[PDB]
RNA sequence: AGUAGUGUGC
RNA sequence: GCUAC
RNA sequence: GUAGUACACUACU
């Protein structure tokens, strides 16, 4: 599937770039490239419009075609020309094609054409409606201004890529990037700046102390250059770049000497780079053990271990009942009957007696049911009615399973002992286990063996559950082996153990919510032997109790307290486990993690044992402590740094790896990591490159081979490199969030900040250096590299300031920016005494009351220098600053420039992210003015970084994966081209001779080397020299001097910023009672005198990422120049690519040379990478930096050898819990979005379905909707199973996986409607498009539908149509209180506006008189303030402002499941107290039968969710029209950006509100699509009805009606870069949908998909012309296939008989080939099928003519020895002269314009010519010239005399490029004539007497006429009578799939089963006589040649073979 | 007891 | 925290 | 100031 070009022209463009040297020649190449892009869009657009593609016809020809009756001279015409014309229903349309991204050239051509044709038109009286059609190439959408043109073509389906023009322009600007005659000519205009952002600067910057320090640090001339550069105004100078050129030429000497010295270091390097090996890992391990022993308390006792899993387990007893009361009685009689005397035994007997109800069970059940009936009858909680414990028998029963701790049944000593020593109620180095010990590893191993012994037995249960019963069909359809592995998981005791711990922990969390201080509760699970006592206590204290018959038959992961002997067997109690509800939340969701981990480690690997995988994964998925976190995150660095070529894994293991082994699984996993480090050294050389298939267009096969030679890490077996990287990188995503205590991480973060600040105060003094001193910057090199990079990026794009002002909204108001109006944290530096002491006395008073039922003034006294701070939200702080008139509604950049002076102190505080690493990171909360100023600086740096092709800003949404792939593929192509070019003579000599000479001849070949530096930077923001950014701001030409001066004054005040210590950190450190010894906190704060520390050199994390990105890419450009000069010293080639993302780096180096060894080059390149980072004040973290040959690794994205790769398991594991617990639909939608992101990153289909199954399971677990539970909707609706219920009513998702990954939870409704169309549309239009099936809904009989279908249509008609803001229906309504909502200023204004005398009605009428800011916000200050007051009435917003843990949200959605939480009033009023779920079900099914379903209801169902979205139309057309092709393996994967299927909401809703379209055509067409629906009047009928039944006019009802109206209009209107990983590169949109359906149907292989009709429709308006274009495309595919099939596979003597036999009785894609051939013969592009029309005999002069009219070739004559005739299309020259002197020269053209004369002179004087024009002549008017070019090169083109003088002047600029005149020769007489026809219709039949080929005929001497090619996979869609030819059926050859290959080897080595399809003899006598009806042309045989590189690989390419390699010979060898 | 910790907490 | 007196 | 502070699982085991 090639894009849009061919061999003939794409190779010519690639050649014409790769030889030129002149800037005029390069500009001509660029203008020809833009012209070819224009011509390509013109051809495809005219093909789409089904009009004739004209060739820039003049107005004379247009009028003489539309009035072919008048005199051709009288009525006038201008001398300009259109692109094409169109005259229909007596209106002439004039058409122009633009491929611009700007709209300005379109309107310039509009008012350039309009007035000249209005001069014409009111003479002949014809409406000339001129049309411009502007395609945007980077985002393909059409801009047709002529709205009188769109009613003929309301949708246009042009689906072409402009990428192969972009890469051509890319390599063109790559080649002449350093040129300067090129750039100023290819400039879009002159360099312009906009208005200043401020009038005045800051004179106080020049006397600021930080500037004084910066200035005194530099030498004197750099002080002069800095001062001279700040005061430089680019707008006031004659050249904008005179400053940058001046400073560059100043520092050039030191720059050149530095690059030359560092490049001369290529010879000083002996190649002993830091390899990893066994000694380095062993010595680093020994240093690690010494460091960890001297930092930890290393214990050798075994019983110092901590619980590896906080749970013990034993299997169930099938002899007992699984009844709740019976299990309660059994737990009581088992706890009381304990034999023996241990410590806590009498306490356990007393607790067994406290839950003893004896024989009184019915009383218990009745009492508890009465209480639950009273609790469930209210939405709110039951208030002011106390719970009395009822003495049932011997238990004081408070609720169901909540018993009172009776002091009469326990004695006080045992009670104290149990609550104190066992439960911990009222109780110096960190102790870890000795991982390095022998007996401790033996004990850990024995634990793993015992757990594998007990848990791998069978359950005895049935293996089915929700996952299996609802999704196992789809899972088994994608992969049977995943279904079998999942069945094997479900059979074992692993799954039952983790399911019991999930169910039991959910019950523990449900039960401990309302547990009291004197009650204990019992939690039960489905296992009738596993129990839990939840102790009185927010955290959870529980203890597992296991009943078991035989002793030692318990799963004990280090958690057991003791086993005891009871009645009927043994009883085991675990220790008390105290957990917070977050880790319990992760335990609840752990079966999803276990199943995902097991099936993902197991996936497609028959060498792994499943019980080993389960034994590892039950401990990693149930790990909720830091002990495994200390192993999973360092394991990446240890195993990858010991796998790599070069790293410092000794320094990482010695200095950074610190295992923290408190459990025994930590010890076992530590030994796994150690043995994998050793083994990873042992297996670097088992990584093999896959063979690379090329075509000179694309790389088809690529990557690493899939050999299982690698040693598996976490469990025994063998493994692939992809599976090895999975086992390395996946366990970091096993870690939990929120495991950190704030208590310790605030101290750790503050210590890190203050230690770096202290060391910088007392040790770091030098700012600039020259010897790579740490935390210094080389000054000359910084300045020179910045001047070079600013000159390149600024002279490339002149309007950069305008781009920065538009894209970042600098000219608009601050209320229109999402960054300044968010809900993030801000900071207020004021005097907040009163509010803090109010909340302090309230929490103390509260504390005292809770201790009755059984400080900030301290800090303000004990700290004098305390600044006072508070943390509001961002939107509230903007509201406060607008209400206090600090900020206004001016343009935001003027306010930022004012704030850069007005705000002089910056305060930053911090808090913990709570991430899943070992040491937590921190985010720095700034105050609001810091956010404004850093917004200005960072948006300037951001939009300068996006100019760079290798700075990863523009595509943050995983386009970095696509960029990595592009870089890797061009480095593969570079390595192949360079090694085959340099070593061509030596390989010719090797093949010549070829034994002994060949190897020593090979010894002197050019060796290829490919290197990838996967670098991290050490302390990126902390140890950074901030003074280099002063040179970045000062050298920037786009800034006025006042703007530079204010931004640098902000920089200087920012180096005086202060870090506020948070108040809880100080409350920690003041209440310590012992002085911490070497206290860095008390030193830096002067013994806690203050809470602020002046942080200076550390700019904080996340504040200057783009500025640092820009200087980091400058450092990498210096590195690139060093490497290029060093490899030119060796006279080799080099390609250096470097990707930069702030603190990450990926530099890839490809070198082909022959002088020295590769190890010395690796040593040089790594030493110079370190030095290039150090010269700009960076330092590459050499402990975390590694070097490979194959693997790239950018920000968690891989690239193996050109094949992209990602750990998709992180998105599978995130999908287990990621939800805010809003409702079932919203939770399910969030989880499925995570599964979609997994699919984009290369997840196989079966694991994606396992993820969707787990998502449905976890969402139904949250709301008690599992089958059989109380909210199971299955018996409350008319449905067979859960697939037949809509997702809004809590059913499961039934859809194809490609449909889920494209839309997701709109796939259920869409697939239901596609099933309805497949069931109910009439039988003739079954295989028709979706628009042709939706229109025939009118012929449905709705009476005899299925009642399930009527129910599902009525839900969608009445509830999904008129909904609010995929949408839900049954959301539970949480009763939350007033939240905090008192720190806010805006809520306070809402409160004293609510209780105001008539103020709220003023707000409501202000909203209603300007209603657009109900679904947007406002431009103005005032309306932003009014709308942010109005958003408090939304209870969703009020509760979203509250801080909230999601674990409590989970527990509350569990517990409020039987309570009436569904507001059925809002459900009922959409189609006409609170309600439970089941009553919502009953009432909805009752009220829905009250409504009626008509045909017009179904019409507006299909018009709302299919026909009004082009995405839904194309997805439905993919599912209807699919044809699945042939299976094949996924050998080369590739990245494809998801296309936009639609070919500001503030602007269009303000436009529709105030009726002003303000960009001019989008708004009026979109308000047409708004006004056309006309369903508005029912709203105001409801308004009048409410005014009737309430008398007075209502306003709140009018606001609710208007909000519903604008939201259901916003859904019609709806006002991202998504990269996928597909088995091939898609280019079009149909290619993407084909690859998406083929990828997502099996794990083992992908299918090719092609479609019947055009799947890209535009809507229900253009039907007939859509069918016309679809049939035209089918005709095109049919005859491309037939012509190439017949001249590729059939005998040359018999093809036209074959062709006529195909044309008569055959049909391609259900359309007869006769009809398709009539379509081609009658269309306007017959020239595309000239050999077809010739072989059938339907070819006319016009066709052929129109062929050389629109397409061409240069023709020379006359090599006699004196007159030359160079003819082209309407272009011919005649040149008359001797060897010395030329007499005259006559050009001949079609039009005489000075552009076309030079174009024709360029093209006609570049073919094979005689001589070099070697004389001159004085000259006065067009002439032929030549410039000289070094080593016998010249350029031959016609200039004007004036242009000869001008270009001689411009190349006589005082420069270094050596001057070459264009010395001119002979006069050119420019005439004009009609060009003759070069291809007569009768001039072919002699020329093709021996050309027997249906797809290629001769038209010239050496010009052919071809038909394009089409893939043979589409040959299965033919249909017809078997063509018996002797013994073969060629119809079966068309339907074959193994024999249609074009390779000779794949048919020669093919099978007899594949050939037995063809045989149909009926009486022959020889195979040789029957095989005569086949091809005799030589086929293509793939030949692979090894590439001389250190990652050694083979390339394979097609060849023409020899004369014997035919098709008949392959069939005969097969036979 | 559990969790966190070469910062005294829960 | 919340609810009632 | 006093009193109150309300609920899920219930399973093939
Ligand atoms: Mg990295
Ligand atoms: Zn036969």
Author numbering: -3 to 423, 438 to 547, 555 to 871, 892 to 1031, 1039 to 1409, 1423 to 1529, 1545 to 1615, 1622 to 1636, ...
Sentences from the paper on this structure:
To reveal the structure of the C-terminal region of LACV-L and the overall architecture of the complete polymerase, we determined the structure of full length LACV-L (LACV-L FL) by X-ray crystallography and high-resolution cryo-EM. Transcription is initiated by a “cap-snatching” mechanism, whereby host 5′ capped RNAs are bound by the L cap-binding domain (CBD), cleaved by the L endonuclease domain several nucleotides downstream, and then used to prime synthesis of mRNA2,5,6. The previously unobserved C-terminal region (1752–2263) protrudes away from the core and forms an elongated arc-shaped structure that includes the mid domain (residues 1752–1841 and 1978–2025), the CBD (residues 1842–1977), and the ZBD (residues 2026–2263). We also capture snapshots of LACV polymerase in both pre-initiation and elongation-mimicking states, thereby revealing, amongst other conformational changes, the movement of the priming loop that unblocks the active site cavity and permits accommodation of a 10-base-pair template-product duplex, characteristic of elongation.
LACV-L FL was subsequently characterized by cryo-EM, resulting in a 3.0 Å resolution structure. The resulting “stable dataset” was further 3D classified resulting in the separation of two defined states: (i) the expected pre-initiation state and (ii) an elongation-mimicking state in which the complementary 3′ and 5′ vRNA formed a double-stranded RNA that could be accommodated within the active site cavity. Based on the RNA promoter sequences with which the polymerase was incubated, we expected to obtain only the pre-initiation state. In the pre-initiation structure, this loop protrudes towards the active site but is disordered probably due to the absence of RNA and nucleotides. In the cryo-EM map, the polymerase is monomeric and some density present at low threshold suggests that the α-helix 91 may fold back into the same hydrophobic pocket of the ZBD, although the binding might be rather labile. The C-terminal extremity of LACV-L is an α-helical domain with a long protruding β-hairpin. Its two equivalently sized sub-domains surround a metal ion that is coordinated by the residues C2064, H2169, D2178, and H2182, suggesting that it is a zinc ion.
